[PDB]
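> Could you send the DNA replication initiator (Cdc21/Cdc54) prediction when you get a chance?

Sure thing. Input:
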Amino acid sequence: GAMGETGKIDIDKVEGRTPKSERDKFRLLLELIKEYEDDYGGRAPTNILITEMMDRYNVSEEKVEELIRILKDKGAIFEPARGYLKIV
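Output:
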């Protein structure tokens, strides 16, 4: 019916046995850059990133601009034109 099997174990610390993957403000900004790049044929207009981050994720313009500087500074992204962001 069922049968027996081998390689017995026991449960001491063996909780928490699940995967993890999440998001962050840095991630959520960067996600908009790539999800607009393909749409613009390689642009992410910085003003739209701001407006859409306040829409999609309630992030205030000051904070979106800070995300923009941080990831720019890291060379994770760039601003190749006067209000167009790019992933590195």
